[PDB]
Amino acid sequence: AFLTVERMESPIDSADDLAKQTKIEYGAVEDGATMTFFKKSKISTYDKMWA
């Protein structure tokens, strides 16, 4: 039971795995070039990151 939940954790590897877990907080430069990108994007992953 130890060796099957110490594998079933799947640590963060992409923005897709980090689009779901709202425990780990997102972040951006305030009104820089990164914050401007997520505000205008229409991709399903990147719009949820702006939410």
What residue numbers does the annotated binding site for L-glutamate cover? Answer: 33-34
Identify the CA nearest to 20 among candidates 44, 48, 50, 42: 48
Indicate the annotated binding residues: 33-34
The answer to whether the beta carbons of residues 48 and 17 sit under 8 Å apart is: no
